[PDB]
Amino acid sequence: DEETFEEFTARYEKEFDEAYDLFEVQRVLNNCFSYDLVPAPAVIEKALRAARRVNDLPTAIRVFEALKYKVENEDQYKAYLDELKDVRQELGVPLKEELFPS
Amino acid sequence: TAVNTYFVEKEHAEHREHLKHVPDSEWPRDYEFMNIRSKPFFWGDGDKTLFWNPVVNRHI
Amino acid sequence: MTHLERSRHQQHPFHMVMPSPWPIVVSFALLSLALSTALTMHGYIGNMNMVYLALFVLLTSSILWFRDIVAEATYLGDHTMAVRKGINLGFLMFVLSEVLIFAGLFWAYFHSAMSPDVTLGACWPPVGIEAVQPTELPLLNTIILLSSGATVTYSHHALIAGNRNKALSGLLITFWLIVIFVTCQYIEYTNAAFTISDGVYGSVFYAGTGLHFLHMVMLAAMLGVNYWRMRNYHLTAGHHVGYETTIIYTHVLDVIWLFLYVVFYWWGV
Amino acid sequence: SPLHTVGFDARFPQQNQTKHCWQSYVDYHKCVNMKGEDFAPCKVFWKTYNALCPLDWIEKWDDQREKGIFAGDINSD
Amino acid sequence: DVPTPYACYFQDSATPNQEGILELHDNIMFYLLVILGLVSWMLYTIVMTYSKNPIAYKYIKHGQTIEVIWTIFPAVILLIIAFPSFILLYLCDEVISPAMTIKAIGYQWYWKYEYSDFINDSGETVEFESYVIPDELLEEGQLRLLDTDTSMVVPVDTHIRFVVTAADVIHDFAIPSLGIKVDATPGRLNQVSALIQREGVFYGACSELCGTGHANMPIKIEAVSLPKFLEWLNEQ
Amino acid sequence: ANKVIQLQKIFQSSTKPLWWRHPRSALYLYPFYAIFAVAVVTPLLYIPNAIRGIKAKKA
Amino acid sequence: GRIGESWVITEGRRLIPEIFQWSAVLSVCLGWPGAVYFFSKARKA
Amino acid sequence: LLFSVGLFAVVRMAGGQDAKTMNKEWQLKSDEYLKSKNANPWGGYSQVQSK
Amino acid sequence: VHFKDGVYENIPFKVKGRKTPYALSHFGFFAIGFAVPFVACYVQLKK
Amino acid sequence: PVVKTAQNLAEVNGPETLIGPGAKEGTVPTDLDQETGLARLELLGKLEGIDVFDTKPLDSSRKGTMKDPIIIESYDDYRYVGCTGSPAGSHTIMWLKPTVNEVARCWECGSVYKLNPVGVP
Amino acid sequence: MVQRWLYSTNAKDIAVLYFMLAIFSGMAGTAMSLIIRLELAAPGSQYLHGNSQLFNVLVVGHAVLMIFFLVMPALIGGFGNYLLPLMIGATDTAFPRINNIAFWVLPMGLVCLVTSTLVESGAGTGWTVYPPLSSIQAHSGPSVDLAIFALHLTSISSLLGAINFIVTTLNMRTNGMTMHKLPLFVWSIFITAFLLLLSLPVLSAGITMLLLDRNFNTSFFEVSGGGDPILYEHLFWFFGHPEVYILIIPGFGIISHVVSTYSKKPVFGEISMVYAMASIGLLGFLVWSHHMYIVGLDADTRAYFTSATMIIAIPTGIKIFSWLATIHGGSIRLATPMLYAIAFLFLFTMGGLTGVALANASLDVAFHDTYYVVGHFHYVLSMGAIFSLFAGYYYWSPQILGLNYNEKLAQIQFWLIFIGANVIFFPMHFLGINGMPRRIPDYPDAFAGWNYVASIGSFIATLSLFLFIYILYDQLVNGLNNKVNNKSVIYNKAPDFVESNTIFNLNTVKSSSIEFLLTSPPAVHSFNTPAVQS
Ligand code: HEA
Ligand code: HEA
Ligand SMILES: [Cu+2]
């Protein structure tokens, strides 16, 4: 309802900046997914950067699963494809190709 | 107000003193409000009522 | 020390009450009264003295609780502003329920204004139904009751202001006026207006007047209890939990009596 | 009734007719108990009490007139 | 008439008032049905869709559009379901020349109907009781627990008034088939003008407890033509 | 007065029930309820013992 | 870039099974009284 | 469900049935009288509901 | 009043004791519940 | 045993040891030392500037992070406090269960809390 | 046990007594209503050989026990005095003696009714006490007097409970809570207390008038003197209409609470919630004479009353839409309290809309005092009293006592009781819509099959209740063995689907009510420091 993405986006990155442990990472990510605002690739990249800061690969797996299934959004796929591949091959957190065939 | 209430009570509101003795032949033009069957009397002694005041009506 | 006890007894205005037998005994008294009355008015045994003693002991238990509710307010104390506000609000809601009772009594016959019905009445004023009307008969007492209430409300205001010899004079005047009122109530014991045989129009008025003759008794009982307490001088001009109750009662009873005198006396005549 | 007595009724616009019989009966009893020669003044509402009003009310009023304690408020005539 | 077994809808109509009541009933029930269908399907789809929802939309509080939509819709819905009730009350309560008037008093576990509008031989008032025939003393071919020794008669294609009252306890004049239902106050009378356009036998029992023996309250209404009504009156 | 403070001090010293005001009244009232109400409620069901059993069976 | 839906396809393929199931549930919930009516000797069968 | 129906069946068997009606002849007499009086024509004249 | 741990003290039952292994109490509760309808039916008529 | 002045709130031992002397006849006693019950503890305090049962909310604006978690004063073992965002009402009502040894966090608010009781023997 | 229980003065220690009396009374009343349905299965004296007075008396006992002695003592008092002081955070409610005298004044009503049924006199005039049928003219003996004292004592206990509720919630509410942040169940009980206070005295006065007429050889409503029972019916309905709201509103509160705590999302406009509740409470008084359209009032009066009814209906629809908004767009864990809440949202809504349909001024010509109205209120009572109480019990029992319940047993119990209630109450609308009367042990020979299906449903319902009491026993005897194994759910709110399970150890149960954040029930005078909200 006529709410700017930029303010809350910047809040998400700035909270990710001072992520001391995984608790604030978890709470901020849950709040971000709480809105209907589908996360941007930039905020997901910042979240993965915070997760790499806190060193818990399961957070990365969970957020990838959340991106794959968060909202129907008229069943858009290629957006999901790019938003996953850019952040997979930006630095490397190889996690999707193992839980699926198990 | 008190003194004029006392005056009006002693002027024409004292007529109820002789209402106890009244013939049953000049009753006011009343209606179905009375003269109907009443509760049967089982307990009590005084004129089929708790208070022995045979003054309200002359019909039993 | 001081801080810990202050926090542990500050928001706790409730005493660690002993195993008080008041609930079971009062419940037992009410149940005995109910069953005994049912057996006596229409049953197998028509004895009257035993049920009279049952009523007497129920009243003794009620008086015991009612004197405790004010003795523990001063002898035990342990009260704050919040509990005083709660007790006052409880007395206000009690008198509001009494006002609702009075309103129901009024509406029992006050809804027949323009005669909307057809038969069995529906005639205001009830022409033809002219027995000894209980209307305008006790107004000689209602006017003096209004005068007494007017002259004692401000006396009780000066009471709560000072609680001094002026308060004693006001209390004595109240005792005299309530004694006069109970005397003039009992003088019309049997033959007040009439009896109920036919034409129930003033009989409901007589019953409504009769059933309210206990609130003044309760007021007199509280006044006497406070009189005894201040003779014992336990209650100073401090936690006057009973003085406030009596002043609010006398400030609401005059209002309700005024509302009663507004209609039912000059309306329809 | 032969399916034709009044037709359209317009005496009282509102639906409820609780207070209707008294007014339609007072004039009838007054005209009947005054002259008894010609009923022309009250010849237009014959059915308002015979069939349009509860005849229990009519018989109760007749018995009350016999006993002298009328349900309504009229004079002694 | 007779309550049809295993029924799930209203009885057969007998009078225009009752069929108008039925029309108002079905008109109301249409919108009630659509409302209940809407709410039931909403419940069903919610529970069958969001039961698997992993993350809950927990920051939605305002919803102004739906707020105004379901704040303004019920008003017009209620107005459009209330207007037919008003017009039917206006039409039915119209006291359009009630041509017949009989007494109907609810006595202690029986009825004593008095017919004063008509006469029997010369000016006399016809009155008789209505006693329910006992179950043990039933005659073969009757209706159990309800059938009476003698019942009331009524002309067809006319207008009738049922003067209802009581003697000691309040009764009920419950005849759903004829579309009349007025309480029997102990002292207060009530006038209802029932006009019948259909012949037949209409049953009935008092819908008000009369103490203990209210399990057998015979109210049987039999509709006859004008010549048959004259023959019955002459016989009575 | 001259007895409020001493009474409160003694009651605080002796934290005991019965509130010290009416011990004789309590001892007088305690047996009365048991003597009276129990003996007046027992007939209520004792007398209809022979009355009870009205089967009123019909067939 | 409007990938896939076309709301109509997925919307129908999800609702139609759901609507059919809901209608069948209502049909059963109203046919059980009808089942009682049939099984009971309503017509001496 | 099977316990409920079984205990209902056994308690009804123990209680028994003592109605002098509900038999076929009563229903046929009723519908014959109804046809004589022509009541509920557009409905169900048959009221059997039991043996 | 502060001498209760708060485990089973909130119910007027007692696990300790061979007098009632939580069966006689429940049997008695069933009995008192079924008493009023059964006795009400029995006093004027058959069960 | 006898009248106690209790003019100061730091000289009263025993809540019932004070009754409050009054006057029989003359003028009304002043509402300072003539009240039965603990009511003097609040009335004299607010007469001299001491309140009872403060309703002041905690530091809502401060997030209470690791460096400076907020401090609550309660000598009891446990506590019932929480956060509603930096303003008065921001999110759904929520509160925590602080303990003497460990800490607790506010989940969605991220406001880390701490239990601070006064030293006890 | 006498030293602390029979002489109790603690709200927590007496709420459990409230519950015990509620469950015992319910089991007895369900047994007697089982009987009532059992003689209704087939025409004739299948089990009651004559004596329709016994049938009437059993009906009166059923109605009175469920109304005044079962659920009003349960959700008003038992839940109120266990949650409201607990949710506020105050150590103890003001004057627990009030609660004790309110509780202890119940049982003698039970014994006086049981002996009134025992005596040959009996009270067989319905749970409504309309004259003259309850006076010496028709019913002699002590049954009427015992019932009158029973209702008087129940009213007194209710008034005391309302007094305690009002004083606790308004005089010493905790500092953190204010007017604009007060939870929902307490608002419900507050409005309930207001309506109870404005409703009790008129009933007390009218019923005292009837008792005096029966005793003082007079008559104010009876025609014997010129009175008219229309006034008494006015007064009785003026009391009665608030009573259903009194018993139903705390159900609204608890249902809103459970759907809020289980949807993981906040309420939808709690200000709107309290607006709806307050509007309902204040508007309940506009229909004092809406229950007696059959009397013969004026057309304008009927129009005004039906307008008031249709106005009253709207806030309920607003509340239903609010619940739908709360459930929409949220994760749902399909636990048993959700099952009860959904059954409420369905069947209570359908019954209420049926009643709104009947609420037409001229529609009582078809349903009033028929089986349609019993199908009407059985629905809403069962949904908002039986199912509300079930939801509350299964929603608070694992913590208020520390004892869990078998989830499979709970599920099968819910399914059994739901199907039984549906199959019982549904046919009675078909019964009424034909026009069959009410309060008759024997009925004409038309709807035998519907009565039969009602009876088998009643047996299903009583089997469900027996399973429920067996569940109670198993919970009370096997709680520690059930907590350790996988027989029951030990965390009602599962973690959010982002959050790891190890971190979840310190996020056990966090919701919008303090009593869930407490440990195992501590000493009664807990809460040494009052809770404060920042
Ligand atoms: C709580 C309210 C309540 C409940 C539960 C019931 C339960 C039942 N009721 Fe009743 N009933 C009323 C409230 C209730 N009723 C009222 C107010 C009247 C008015 C009387 C009048 O109209 O004159 C009435 C009247 C009434 C009649 C009118 C009879 C006549 O016309 O004379 C009938 C007829 O069969 C009937 C049947 C039943 C049946 C078969 C059940 C069965 O469902 C019994 C099984 C019970 C339920 C399925 C609910 C579970 C109840 C419990 C107590 C479970 C216990 C556990 C907990 C409470 C924790 N009820
Ligand atoms: C739990 C108790 C309870 C509850 C909750 C209710 C709820 C309602 N009741 Fe009922 N009622 C009784 C108990 C109850 N009732 C009892 C005991 C009787 C007497 C039976 C006896 O005497 O034997 C009775 C009788 C009764 C009558 C007279 C019938 C009679 O003879 O019995 C009427 C009619 O005016 C009525 C109306 C309503 C209405 C309008 C509601 C509403 O509050 C329903 C609430 C639900 C909603 C209305 C849902 C919201 C609706 C919408 C979604 C909006 C849709 C419509 C619009 C556009 C506004 N009730
Ligand atoms: Cu209502």
Author numbering:
A (entry chain Q): 45 to 146
B (entry chain S): 66 to 125
C (entry chain O): 1 to 269
D (entry chain U): 7 to 83
E (entry chain P): 16 to 251
F (entry chain N): 2 to 60
G (entry chain V): 22 to 66
H (entry chain W): 103 to 153
Anything the authors wrote about it?
In total, four UQ6 ligands were placed into the map, two in each monomer of CIII, (UQ6 603 J, UQ6 603j at Qi sites and UQ6 606 J, UQ6 606j at Qo sites) with one UQ6 (606 J) having a large break in the tail density. All previously reported structures of the S. cerevisiae respiratory SC contained UQ6 bound in the Qi sites but empty Qo sites. In our structure, UQ6 interacts with His181 of the head domain of Rip1 (Rieske protein) in the Qo site of the opposite-side monomer of CIII, which interacts with the more poorly resolved CIV monomer. The Qo site on the reference-side of CIII, which interacts with the reference CIV, lacks a strong UQ6 tail density, which might be an indication of increased UQ6 flexibility at this site. Two CL molecules (CDL601K/k and CDL302C/c) at each CIII/CIV interface and one CL (CDL501J/j) within each of the monomers of CIII were fit into these densities allowing us to assign possible interactions of the CLs with the SC proteins and other phospholipids. One phosphate residue of CDL501J is in close proximity to Arg4 of Cob and His345 of Cor1 within CIII. Only CDL601K appears to interact with both CIII and CIV through phosphate moieties and Lys35 of Qcr8 in CIII and Lys487 of Cox1 in CIV, respectively. CDL302C is in close proximity to CDL601K, and its phosphates appear to interact with Lys44 and Lys51 of Rip1 on the surface of CIII at the interface with CIV.
